[PDB]
Amino acid sequence: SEIDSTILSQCGTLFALRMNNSSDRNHVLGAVSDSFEGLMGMLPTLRTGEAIIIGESVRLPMRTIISPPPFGRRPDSLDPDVTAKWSNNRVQGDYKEVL
Amino acid sequence: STYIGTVQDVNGANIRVVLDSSLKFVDGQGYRIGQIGSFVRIPIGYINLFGIVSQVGAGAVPDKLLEVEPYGHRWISVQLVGEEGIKKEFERGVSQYPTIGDKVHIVTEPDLKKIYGTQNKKYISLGNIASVDSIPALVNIDTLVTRHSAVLGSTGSGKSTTVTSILQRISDMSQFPSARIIVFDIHGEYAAAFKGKAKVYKVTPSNNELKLSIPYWALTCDEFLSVAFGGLEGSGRNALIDKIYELKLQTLKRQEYEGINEDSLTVDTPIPFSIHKLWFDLYRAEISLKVVPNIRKPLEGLASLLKDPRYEFLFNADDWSVNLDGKTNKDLDALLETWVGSEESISIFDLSGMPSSILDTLIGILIRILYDSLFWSRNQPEGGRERPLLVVLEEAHTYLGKDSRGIAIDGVRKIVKEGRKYGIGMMLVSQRPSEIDSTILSQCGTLFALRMNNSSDRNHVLGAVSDSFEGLMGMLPTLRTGEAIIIGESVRLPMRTIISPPPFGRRPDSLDPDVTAKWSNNRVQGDYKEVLTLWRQKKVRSNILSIGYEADSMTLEIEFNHGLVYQYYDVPETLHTELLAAESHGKFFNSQIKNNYRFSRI
Amino acid sequence: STYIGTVQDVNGANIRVVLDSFVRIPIGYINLFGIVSQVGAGAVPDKLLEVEPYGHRWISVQLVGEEGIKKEFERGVSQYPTIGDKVHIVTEPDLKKIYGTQNKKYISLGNIASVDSIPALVNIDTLVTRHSAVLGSTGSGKSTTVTSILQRISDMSQFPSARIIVFDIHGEYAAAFKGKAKVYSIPYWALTCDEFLSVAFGGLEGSGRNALIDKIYELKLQTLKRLTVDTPIPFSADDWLDALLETWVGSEESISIFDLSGMPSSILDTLIGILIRILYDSLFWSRNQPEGGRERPLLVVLEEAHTYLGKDSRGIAIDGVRKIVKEGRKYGIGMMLVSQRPSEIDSTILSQCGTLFALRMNNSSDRNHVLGAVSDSFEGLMGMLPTLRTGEAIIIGESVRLPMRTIISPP
Amino acid sequence: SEIDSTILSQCGTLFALRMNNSSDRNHVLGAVSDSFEGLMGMLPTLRTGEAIIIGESVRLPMRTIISPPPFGRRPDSLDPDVTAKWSNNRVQGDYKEVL
Amino acid sequence: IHGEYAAAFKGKAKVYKVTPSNNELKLSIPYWALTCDEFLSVAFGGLEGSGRNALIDKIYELKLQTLKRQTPIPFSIHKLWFDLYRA
Ligand SMILES: Nc1ncnc2c1ncn2[C@@H]1O[C@H](COP(=O)(O)OP(=O)(O)OP(O)(O)=S)[C@@H](O)[C@H]1O
Ligand SMILES: [Mg+2]
């Protein structure tokens, strides 16, 4: 719902995944060429991985489960895990180093 | 009676049901068979299709049937939410949608546990669920901290107590011995919740309490000029910047600091420099301890600031006061250690006793001292990567305005945008969501919605929620006191919990002067000459748990709850020993002692 | 028996009822309540009009609060109603309970519009500490209402040691307070230097300002023998200090007034600012004494404020009023805003007034602004403003459990 | 059909005359409690001057022919008579007065 | 609203036209009988901004002036026009 409508309408293909709130669902329906009654009503409960691909890149709209990449080849961000860090017993620190 | 009826319509994401019979208010606890937000389930073959009650009554019957049966309404609309695995787990999304004529049951305790319970170690307990018995509300802790939070509601909703509960449950020494949290208390009420388990910094410390001091040389150039002078923009600004540079270079030549030399010295550098010498030298050219002597008006302004007890937390720091020679007893090491490295996890910078005019520019400064200090040591064992931090902000709608031009907005926006990498959280306690900038409220991860009376703010909340679920958001303006709707990515699904209130005696209360008490007691003549002798110099100098003893000054001393110290003057000591031996506390003192003798609180 | 109809639609916070202003819904052991939000042919479901647009027997009601087992009445509900439930009409005991409170912090200010027996209780502690606000119109006769409030919360029956001040201009309250309250000399040296320059000399700018500050400084010093410039020590007209303080705050009478009709309109803003600053500064330093605001809170009330709290007024009064609004809570200092034309008072100040009394309002701009500057709101509190009876008022704020319609009367 | 029903409801006595369109008969018959098929089905063939009175001003509703007032007392607007004013021979006129 | 009953009662009633004849009455509705909102609607169009407040206040001075010399009380437009247009 935040992407500029004119730009979003010039994308040939779409991979509509699970969509939760009632506003983005409508804004997506409002820029999809092959608005297809059968499949667009099941947007809000596609599982983790499903993707309704709609556009000219496919002859007829699909409902495909994207094949997951093999383990180890997954996207991950090395952000800290507070529960595993706040649990470690405190160690005396010298703040001369921080300053 | 795990049975309701048969699905009659199936729109893929909006099924409907036709209730069959009579509604009974189950006694003992009060849970009815079916509510507006109550969950439902549908066994399909071998798996379970769970849903939420979206609408009840004439609003769910299929449309044209109203023409068929104008006044026949027995239908419900259920929106199907997720699904259960084959004895594996609950996951969202549906592998296969239902057909017409299926069976629709009601949620039972094992399903309560399966949906709501989990096995990950991150999740913790923050109050049990409403409309069902004994189900702790599990909130992911990692996501809640690193993905930022928020609290919203009405004035009497009770958000301070919810925040107190969360902080109490998030810092217990049992599981999190090295926690760390900071609270920018403003009205000054949390300080009563954590009596002997947190550090509190005020402006007028008590006998067993600390003094908040923010040295004036820990500021950048822009911040310091903003606080002191209001942001000069002429050649006077250039003159003052050059003078600050000269003072810092001079002190560095006087004293040595690790790895700083004239080649890498800037105004932003946090090193000591004497304000008094600056003022005196910049004023002599236009004509120390004591302030007796084209930027003149600025220098009268700063001179007035120097000798002002209100500004005793900047220019007359307790031991961060800097001598003439740029020499201080202690460096910023002690300040950082106390603020974030102390032995107590939580610290409270209650800013109630601050000149409101600067309050905003004060908040920002602290947020800049912490972040900038936890960013340049992100590899050491004292940075945010090794012991992350959570910041709390009370009454955020005044500083995070959509159009506000202060500095706090910049700091909070920076923590929201860039705090993920370095483990910095944020918790915005607010009261009028529509005020808060819509770009920042859309980056907060989790939301603790509460009662909201205004229709103009409910719409804002509904329009700015990641999972705009309606079964749990059509009931915003009727929630109880403490009934919270948790929606975000910090929980597997929306929750409708009640927060376990903190035990009696551990609660926040800003000690406001109760007008009833101070106007019911009988009038006693005042010594206004004391008021004048106290104002000229610009200075301030039920239950009973102890009584002071003295028989030489003709005085009495008493202590109440909350650390209130009262000194009663001109009291003959015979009555002192009479009271002490009376063993009548709260009654004899009530009898003829409340309003007989003068007393001055200390 | 009393009865209205049956519930036929629910979406959590909004109910529809089909027939055979407050309303009560029973559940057994507990009692839900509510108010009729929308009525008429527009209340029916959206597409149910097409089927039958002329038979209207649907009423839309909003749940409001819950009542326990004769314990208390608290907002928000723990359960909800479902199809097949009953709806009654509010009776005398129901009003007796929802508006009846056992807390000692509540004081009676009047009665209900329909019923006269039950008082219109208000929490004085919040009314003083949080803040107050009275918005009215020329023909609403706000004077009698505010007088009744002032002399009803300050009676010597239960609050002998009250302390109030009125900054009245038109002098109308002098007649209202014959002898039951005081009525009214500001020294020319107490006020700060800059205010004195502004009031008398006309706001000098050049080096003459510096020379005059200098001269006043040495006159101030030489006064001491027979340290700072701003010291309120007398130096060498009656109008153009312990006794003055006691007369202002230490007087035996509970209330006090300041009639400023005769003074010029030009300097009156600076004078109100000076007075308010003096009071606040004195009661901020006297915090730790029996004379302080912590032991006898003070309340300030001023009328005709819409000419002083404008959106971009440059007077000194706005600064002191803002200081009271923000920091005055801690030191036990209150405030009360009376204004017959609130469209001019800035929103950023009117948004901080906890308790709001509304009187007869006719114009649309005022009716829009009041809704835009309120923390609570009900649908049954917008369309009846212009038809209010003289002497009635609508209370909305956090100092009352629920918003009310009440008539104020002297005791 | 278009008048407000809220203000029409409270009216006590009603006079109804011949009606042609089928959208107004429904509104008028929905404005009366005495739902009689005869009293609102014989409506669209009522001669000029006939009318049915329904309400508490009349003991029993029924159809009656209202007598006409005598010649010389009969409402009529004096709108121009085009056929008579166009039949007469063209008269040369001067528009200077009109301007 | 069609001037159709005037001929019904040749002499049994009295009519109030807007452009009468030598021997007929003239309808007269003094503006000042109107209430504030009605007058603003008829003469101006129901303004809301500062102009509405200015005119509402302006009426008050003239009304109270007339009353003190001797709410539905007479007052003059022309003086209003000149006074607040000369401004
Ligand atoms: N979960 C709760 N259950 C019952 N009472 C609560 C609960 N939480 C808070 N309260 C009480 O409701 C009153 C107000 O709640 P507080 O949280 O203390 O104040 P607050 O108004 O929410 O904070 P501000 O002024 O909006 S920042 C107090 O009497 C609380 O004791
Ligand atoms: Mg609070």
Short mmCIF file of N, CA and C in Angstrom, two decimals, chain A:
data_model
loop_
_atom_site.label_atom_id
_atom_site.label_comp_id
_atom_site.label_asym_id
_atom_site.label_seq_id
_atom_site.Cartn_x
_atom_site.Cartn_y
_atom_site.Cartn_z
N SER A 1 0.81 -1.21 0.00
CA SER A 1 0.00 0.00 0.00
C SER A 1 0.84 1.27 0.00
N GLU A 2 2.14 1.16 0.28
CA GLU A 2 3.01 2.33 0.30
C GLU A 2 3.74 2.55 -1.01
N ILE A 3 3.97 1.49 -1.80
CA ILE A 3 4.65 1.68 -3.07
C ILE A 3 3.80 2.55 -3.97
N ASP A 4 4.45 3.42 -4.74
CA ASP A 4 3.73 4.28 -5.66
C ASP A 4 2.92 3.45 -6.64
N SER A 5 1.65 3.82 -6.82
CA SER A 5 0.76 2.99 -7.63
C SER A 5 1.21 2.94 -9.08
N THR A 6 1.68 4.06 -9.62
CA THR A 6 2.07 4.09 -11.02
C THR A 6 3.24 3.15 -11.28
N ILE A 7 4.20 3.09 -10.36
CA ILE A 7 5.31 2.15 -10.52
C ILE A 7 4.82 0.72 -10.34
N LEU A 8 4.01 0.48 -9.31
CA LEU A 8 3.58 -0.88 -9.04
C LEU A 8 2.76 -1.45 -10.19
N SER A 9 2.09 -0.60 -10.96
CA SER A 9 1.29 -1.09 -12.07
C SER A 9 2.11 -1.45 -13.30
N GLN A 10 3.37 -1.03 -13.37
CA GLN A 10 4.23 -1.30 -14.51
C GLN A 10 5.09 -2.54 -14.32
N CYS A 11 4.94 -3.25 -13.21
CA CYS A 11 5.63 -4.52 -13.02
C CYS A 11 4.85 -5.61 -13.73
N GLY A 12 5.52 -6.36 -14.61
CA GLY A 12 4.82 -7.37 -15.37
C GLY A 12 4.28 -8.50 -14.51
N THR A 13 5.11 -9.03 -13.62
CA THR A 13 4.79 -10.23 -12.85
C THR A 13 4.66 -9.90 -11.38
N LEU A 14 3.86 -10.71 -10.68
CA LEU A 14 3.70 -10.59 -9.24
C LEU A 14 3.76 -11.97 -8.61
N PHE A 15 4.35 -12.05 -7.42
CA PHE A 15 4.38 -13.25 -6.59
C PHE A 15 3.63 -12.91 -5.31
N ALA A 16 2.31 -12.95 -5.35
CA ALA A 16 1.52 -12.57 -4.19
C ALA A 16 1.63 -13.67 -3.15
N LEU A 17 2.29 -13.38 -2.03
CA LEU A 17 2.43 -14.31 -0.92
C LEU A 17 1.30 -14.06 0.07
N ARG A 18 1.45 -14.56 1.30
CA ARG A 18 0.49 -14.24 2.35
C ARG A 18 0.44 -12.74 2.58
N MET A 19 -0.78 -12.20 2.68
CA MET A 19 -1.01 -10.78 2.90
C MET A 19 -2.08 -10.62 3.97
N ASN A 20 -1.73 -9.93 5.05
CA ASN A 20 -2.50 -9.96 6.28
C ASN A 20 -3.53 -8.84 6.38
N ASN A 21 -3.07 -7.59 6.39
CA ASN A 21 -3.97 -6.48 6.65
C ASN A 21 -4.88 -6.23 5.45
N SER A 22 -6.02 -5.60 5.74
CA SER A 22 -7.08 -5.46 4.75
C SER A 22 -6.82 -4.37 3.72
N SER A 23 -5.77 -3.57 3.90
CA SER A 23 -5.49 -2.46 2.99
C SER A 23 -4.56 -2.87 1.85
N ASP A 24 -3.45 -3.53 2.18
CA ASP A 24 -2.53 -3.96 1.14
C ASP A 24 -3.17 -4.99 0.22
N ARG A 25 -4.04 -5.85 0.76
CA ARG A 25 -4.71 -6.81 -0.10
C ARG A 25 -5.47 -6.09 -1.21
N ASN A 26 -6.25 -5.07 -0.84
CA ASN A 26 -7.01 -4.33 -1.84
C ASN A 26 -6.09 -3.58 -2.79
N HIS A 27 -5.02 -2.99 -2.27
CA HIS A 27 -4.12 -2.25 -3.15
C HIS A 27 -3.41 -3.16 -4.14
N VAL A 28 -3.16 -4.42 -3.75
CA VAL A 28 -2.60 -5.39 -4.69
C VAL A 28 -3.64 -5.77 -5.73
N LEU A 29 -4.87 -6.04 -5.30
CA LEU A 29 -5.91 -6.35 -6.27
C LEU A 29 -6.11 -5.20 -7.25
N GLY A 30 -5.82 -3.98 -6.82
CA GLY A 30 -6.04 -2.82 -7.66
C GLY A 30 -4.99 -2.58 -8.72
N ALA A 31 -3.99 -3.46 -8.85
CA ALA A 31 -2.96 -3.28 -9.86
C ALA A 31 -2.55 -4.61 -10.49
N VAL A 32 -3.45 -5.59 -10.48
CA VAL A 32 -3.16 -6.92 -11.01
C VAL A 32 -4.03 -7.13 -12.24
N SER A 33 -3.39 -7.39 -13.38
CA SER A 33 -4.10 -7.45 -14.64
C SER A 33 -5.13 -8.57 -14.64
N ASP A 34 -4.72 -9.77 -14.27
CA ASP A 34 -5.59 -10.94 -14.37
C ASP A 34 -6.27 -11.23 -13.03
N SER A 35 -7.02 -10.24 -12.55
CA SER A 35 -7.78 -10.42 -11.32
C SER A 35 -8.66 -11.64 -11.50
N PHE A 36 -8.39 -12.70 -10.74
CA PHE A 36 -8.95 -14.01 -10.98
C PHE A 36 -9.68 -14.45 -9.72
N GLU A 37 -11.00 -14.59 -9.82
CA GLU A 37 -11.82 -14.71 -8.62
C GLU A 37 -11.46 -15.96 -7.81
N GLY A 38 -11.17 -17.06 -8.49
CA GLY A 38 -10.92 -18.30 -7.77
C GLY A 38 -9.76 -18.19 -6.80
N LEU A 39 -8.63 -17.63 -7.25
CA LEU A 39 -7.40 -17.68 -6.48
C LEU A 39 -7.12 -16.43 -5.65
N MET A 40 -7.66 -15.28 -6.01
CA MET A 40 -7.33 -14.07 -5.26
C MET A 40 -8.06 -13.99 -3.93
N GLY A 41 -9.09 -14.80 -3.71
CA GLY A 41 -9.78 -14.79 -2.44
C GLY A 41 -9.07 -15.53 -1.33
N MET A 42 -8.10 -16.37 -1.68
CA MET A 42 -7.35 -17.14 -0.70
C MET A 42 -6.01 -16.50 -0.37
N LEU A 43 -5.88 -15.20 -0.61
CA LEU A 43 -4.62 -14.51 -0.35
C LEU A 43 -4.20 -14.54 1.12
N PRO A 44 -5.09 -14.35 2.10
CA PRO A 44 -4.63 -14.11 3.47
C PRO A 44 -4.23 -15.35 4.25
N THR A 45 -4.18 -16.52 3.63
CA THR A 45 -3.84 -17.73 4.37
C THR A 45 -2.96 -18.67 3.56
N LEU A 46 -2.20 -18.15 2.61
CA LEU A 46 -1.18 -18.95 1.95
C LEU A 46 -0.08 -19.29 2.95
N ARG A 47 0.36 -20.54 2.95
CA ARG A 47 1.30 -21.00 3.95
C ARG A 47 2.64 -20.28 3.78
N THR A 48 3.59 -20.65 4.62
CA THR A 48 4.93 -20.09 4.55
C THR A 48 5.69 -20.69 3.37
N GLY A 49 5.65 -20.01 2.23
CA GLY A 49 6.34 -20.49 1.05
C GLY A 49 5.48 -20.40 -0.19
N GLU A 50 4.17 -20.48 -0.02
CA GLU A 50 3.27 -20.42 -1.16
C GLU A 50 3.36 -19.06 -1.84
N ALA A 51 3.08 -19.04 -3.13
CA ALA A 51 3.17 -17.81 -3.91
C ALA A 51 2.27 -17.93 -5.12
N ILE A 52 1.24 -17.10 -5.18
CA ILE A 52 0.37 -17.04 -6.35
C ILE A 52 1.04 -16.13 -7.37
N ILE A 53 1.50 -16.70 -8.48
CA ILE A 53 2.24 -15.94 -9.48
C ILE A 53 1.26 -15.51 -10.57
N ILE A 54 1.11 -14.20 -10.73
CA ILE A 54 0.13 -13.63 -11.65
C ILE A 54 0.84 -12.65 -12.57
N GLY A 55 0.60 -12.76 -13.86
CA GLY A 55 1.16 -11.83 -14.81
C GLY A 55 1.32 -12.49 -16.16
N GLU A 56 2.10 -11.83 -17.02
CA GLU A 56 2.35 -12.33 -18.36
C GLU A 56 3.46 -13.37 -18.41
N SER A 57 4.27 -13.48 -17.36
CA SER A 57 5.33 -14.47 -17.35
C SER A 57 4.80 -15.89 -17.32
N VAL A 58 3.52 -16.08 -17.02
CA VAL A 58 2.90 -17.39 -16.97
C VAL A 58 1.65 -17.37 -17.84
N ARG A 59 1.39 -18.48 -18.53
CA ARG A 59 0.21 -18.54 -19.39
C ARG A 59 -1.07 -18.35 -18.58
N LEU A 60 -1.17 -19.03 -17.44
CA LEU A 60 -2.35 -18.98 -16.60
C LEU A 60 -1.87 -18.86 -15.17
N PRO A 61 -2.55 -18.09 -14.31
CA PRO A 61 -2.08 -17.96 -12.93
C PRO A 61 -1.91 -19.31 -12.26
N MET A 62 -0.89 -19.41 -11.42
CA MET A 62 -0.56 -20.64 -10.72
C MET A 62 -0.85 -20.45 -9.23
N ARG A 63 -0.58 -21.49 -8.45
CA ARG A 63 -0.48 -21.37 -6.99
C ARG A 63 0.66 -22.28 -6.57
N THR A 64 1.88 -21.76 -6.58
CA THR A 64 3.06 -22.60 -6.47
C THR A 64 3.69 -22.48 -5.09
N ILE A 65 4.16 -23.61 -4.57
CA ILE A 65 4.96 -23.64 -3.35
C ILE A 65 6.42 -23.55 -3.78
N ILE A 66 7.05 -22.40 -3.51
CA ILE A 66 8.43 -22.21 -3.95
C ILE A 66 9.31 -23.27 -3.30
N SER A 67 10.16 -23.90 -4.11
CA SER A 67 11.01 -24.97 -3.61
C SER A 67 12.08 -24.40 -2.69
N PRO A 68 12.14 -24.80 -1.42
CA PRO A 68 13.06 -24.14 -0.49
C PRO A 68 14.50 -24.42 -0.87
N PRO A 69 15.41 -23.49 -0.59
CA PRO A 69 16.83 -23.76 -0.79
C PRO A 69 17.36 -24.73 0.25
N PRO A 70 18.42 -25.47 -0.07
CA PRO A 70 18.93 -26.46 0.88
C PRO A 70 19.48 -25.81 2.14
N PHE A 71 19.43 -26.55 3.24
CA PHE A 71 19.90 -26.02 4.51
C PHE A 71 21.37 -25.61 4.40
N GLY A 72 21.73 -24.57 5.13
CA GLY A 72 23.04 -23.96 5.05
C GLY A 72 23.08 -22.87 4.02
N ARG A 73 22.33 -23.05 2.94
CA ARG A 73 22.13 -22.01 1.93
C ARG A 73 20.79 -21.31 2.16
N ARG A 74 20.69 -20.65 3.31
CA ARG A 74 19.53 -19.86 3.67
C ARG A 74 19.95 -18.45 4.03
N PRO A 75 19.07 -17.47 3.87
CA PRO A 75 19.42 -16.11 4.27
C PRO A 75 19.31 -15.94 5.77
N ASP A 76 20.31 -15.27 6.35
CA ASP A 76 20.35 -15.06 7.78
C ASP A 76 21.14 -13.80 8.09
N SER A 77 20.72 -13.09 9.13
CA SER A 77 21.37 -11.88 9.61
C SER A 77 21.87 -12.12 11.02
N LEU A 78 23.15 -11.83 11.26
CA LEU A 78 23.80 -12.19 12.52
C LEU A 78 23.53 -11.14 13.60
N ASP A 79 22.24 -10.93 13.87
CA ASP A 79 21.86 -10.00 14.92
C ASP A 79 21.98 -10.67 16.29
N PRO A 80 22.25 -9.90 17.34
CA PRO A 80 22.44 -10.51 18.66
C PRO A 80 21.15 -11.10 19.19
N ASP A 81 21.30 -12.13 20.02
CA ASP A 81 20.18 -12.79 20.68
C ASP A 81 20.24 -12.45 22.16
N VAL A 82 19.34 -11.57 22.61
CA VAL A 82 19.47 -11.00 23.94
C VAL A 82 19.29 -12.07 25.00
N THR A 83 18.39 -13.02 24.77
CA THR A 83 18.10 -14.01 25.80
C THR A 83 19.31 -14.89 26.07
N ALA A 84 20.12 -15.16 25.06
CA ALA A 84 21.34 -15.93 25.26
C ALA A 84 22.50 -15.09 25.76
N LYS A 85 22.41 -13.76 25.69
CA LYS A 85 23.46 -12.87 26.17
C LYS A 85 23.17 -12.31 27.55
N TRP A 86 21.93 -11.92 27.83
CA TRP A 86 21.59 -11.46 29.17
C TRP A 86 21.66 -12.57 30.20
N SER A 87 21.63 -13.83 29.77
CA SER A 87 21.65 -14.94 30.72
C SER A 87 23.05 -15.20 31.26
N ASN A 88 24.08 -15.02 30.45
CA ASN A 88 25.44 -15.28 30.91
C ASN A 88 25.75 -14.47 32.15
N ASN A 89 26.34 -15.12 33.14
CA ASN A 89 26.66 -14.45 34.39
C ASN A 89 27.54 -13.23 34.13
N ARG A 90 27.23 -12.14 34.82
CA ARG A 90 27.94 -10.89 34.57
C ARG A 90 29.42 -11.04 34.87
N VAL A 91 30.25 -10.39 34.05
CA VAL A 91 31.69 -10.37 34.23
C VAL A 91 32.11 -8.93 34.48
N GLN A 92 32.96 -8.72 35.48
CA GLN A 92 33.39 -7.38 35.81
C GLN A 92 34.00 -6.70 34.60
N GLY A 93 33.56 -5.48 34.32
CA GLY A 93 34.02 -4.73 33.17
C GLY A 93 34.71 -3.45 33.60
N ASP A 94 35.70 -3.05 32.80
CA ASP A 94 36.40 -1.79 32.99
C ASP A 94 35.98 -0.85 31.87
N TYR A 95 35.42 0.29 32.23
CA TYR A 95 34.91 1.22 31.23
C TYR A 95 35.96 2.21 30.76
N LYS A 96 37.19 2.12 31.26
CA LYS A 96 38.26 2.91 30.66
C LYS A 96 38.41 2.55 29.19
N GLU A 97 38.20 1.28 28.85
CA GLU A 97 38.33 0.85 27.46
C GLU A 97 37.23 1.45 26.59
N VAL A 98 35.99 1.47 27.08
CA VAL A 98 34.90 2.03 26.28
C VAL A 98 35.13 3.51 26.03
N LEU A 99 35.51 4.24 27.07
CA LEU A 99 35.78 5.66 26.90
C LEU A 99 36.95 5.89 25.96
#
